[PDB]
A paper describes a structure:
In this study, we report the synthesis, reactivity, and structural profiling of novel compounds featuring cyclic aliphatic linkers. In contrast to the GDP core, the linker is solvent exposed and not involved in additional interactions with the protein. However, whereas a small shift of the 2’- and 3’-OH groups of the ribose by approximately 1 Å can be observed for compound 7a that is possibly induced by the highly strained and bend conformation of the linker, this is not the case for compound 7b. Interestingly, three molecules of RAS were found in the asymmetric unit, with the orientation of the linker near the covalently modified Cys13 modeled differently in these 3 instances, and the electron density less well-defined than in the remaining molecule. This suggests flexibility of the linker, which is consistent with the results of MS studies and indicates that the linker is less strained compared to compound 7a. However, it also suggests that pre-organization of the linker still needs to be optimized by further rigidification to contribute to an efficient covalent reaction. Compared to the previously published compound 7a containing a short linear ethylendiamine linker, our X-ray crystallographic data suggest a less strained conformation of the cyclic linker in compound 7b and reduced impact on the ribose, while retaining a similar reactivity towards Cys13. Upon modification of the protein with the covalent nucleotide analogs, no nucleotide exchange was observed for compounds 7a and 7b, including the linear and cyclic linkers, respectively, that showed the highest reactivities in the previous experiments. In contrast, KRASG13C covalently modified with molecules 7a and 7b cannot become activated in the presence of GppNHp and SOS and consequently did not interact with the Raf RBD.
Kirsten rat sarcoma (KRAS) is one of the most prominent oncogenes in human tumors, found in approximately 30 % of cases. Oncogenic mutations in KRAS cause a shift of equilibrium from the inactive guanosine diphosphate (GDP)-bound state to the active guanosine triphosphate (GTP)-bound state, thereby amplifying proliferative signaling pathways and promoting uncontrolled cell growth. Another significant mutation hotspot within the KRAS gene is codon 13, where mutations occur in approximately 14 % of tumors. Within this subset, 6 % feature a glycine-to-cysteine substitution (KRASG13C), presenting a potential anchor point for the design of covalent inhibitors.
Numbering used by the authors: 1 to 59, 68 to 168
The structure:
């Protein structure tokens, strides 16, 4: 089976861990330790192809070198976390020495009403980067599979 090393990055408290845990364990862990940086593995079938996902939940430079695709996560109720996205993307470009790195922009906490980052803002940013944008809720699981599977599809497109 093919293996994909994915890396989840973004400001603190945006939901990187909650998203990863939903993908791996299929439940919403609300109070997860904010300091645990670790990799999780799960065998899934994506578009009929069996894949082993090796996902690093960031909170280290060994996985930025080996990571094949990156989830850029902000929270839709956290303007600063969206402003920080550019920093994370630039840091990945620097380590990869490349402008063509599979990435997906993720706007998490879509269940909340207290939104300060417009969907149009995020779509504008993703368009500028040339990457997909997916809105998620780790709480309700909305969009969680879509975010990670979309990233795998971008790595597959990249390799082909
Ligand atoms: C950082 C400030 C903060 O959120 N403080 C606390 C007060 C008490 C506990 N509570 C909490 O644990 O929030 C977690 C988590 O439940 C929440 N979260 C994550 N994803 C979602 C989502 O999709 N919808 C909603 N309504 N809440 C979500 O946010 C924090 C942080 O989650 P995390 O540890 O996964 O974030 P990481 O630092 O990026 O890993 C709020
Ligand atoms: Mg975390």
């Amino acid at each position: 089976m093919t293996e994909y090393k994915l890396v989840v990055v973004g400001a603190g408290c945006v939901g990187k861990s909650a998203l990863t845990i939903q993908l791996i364990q299929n439940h919403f862990v609300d109070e997860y330790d904010p300091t645990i940086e670790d990799s999780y593995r799960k065998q899934v079938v994506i578009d009929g192809e069996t894949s082993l996902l090796d996902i690093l939940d960031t909170a280290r430079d060994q996985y930025m070198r080996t990571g094949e695709g990156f989830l850029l996560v902000f929270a839709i109720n956290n303007t600063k976390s969206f402003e920080d996205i550019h920093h994370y993307r630039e840091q990945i470009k620097r380590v990869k020495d490349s402008e063509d790195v599979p990435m997906v922009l993720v706007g998490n906490k879509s269940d909340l009403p207290s939104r300060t980052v417009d969907t149009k803002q995020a779509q504008d940013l993703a368009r500028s980067y040339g990457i997909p944008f997916i809105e998620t809720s780790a709480k309700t699981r909305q969009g969680v599979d879509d975010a990670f599977y979309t990233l795998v599809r971008e790595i597959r497109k990249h390799k082909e």
